[PDB]
């Protein structure tokens with residue numbers, strides 16, 4: 301697994317935009333288009 | 335409403351993302367497993383040699 | 384760095400609340416990488432990270 305492979309320098313850096321921010325962007329787009 | 339059902343009753347709707355995740359996981363697993371190959375050497379452990 | 388019955392490995396030997404088989408020997412994970420080694424003296428398991 302991705303979290304189970306952190307043994308040989310395998311670092312999975314976090315995404316810059318959190319899922320909450322993406323959800324907020326989608327909600328803003330939906331409100332704007334509506 | 336149908337859209338929800340179209341996803342509720344079907345597990346293959348997210349085929350693309352699942353395939354991408356599976357490909358990445360398989361690549362990482364193969365890379366990790368490659369460390370346990372002798373490659374013609376006596377052993378695959380640095381301390382052993 | 385710990386020498387456990389022939390394995391020389393660098394890590395942290397914490398305490399693991401996992402139930403193992405009666406006859407106790409080394410451990411392994413999905414990627415064939417050791418993640419838990421037994422305690423020869425006391426019947427308690429130790430994780431490696």
Ligand SMILES: *[C@@H]1O[C@H](CO)[C@@H](O[C@@H]2O[C@H](CO)[C@@H](O)[C@H](O)[C@H]2NC(C)=O)[C@H](O)[C@H]1NC(C)=O
Nearest residue numbers: 404405406407408421422423424425426427428
């Ligand atoms: C390994 O040897 C040690 C040394 O005697 C044992 O330690 C004893 O363990 C019992 C069981 O918990 C205790 O009641 C004693 O008080 C301990 N004594 C000492 C001096 O530590 C240990 O039990 C042994 N382990 C095995 C698996 O045989």
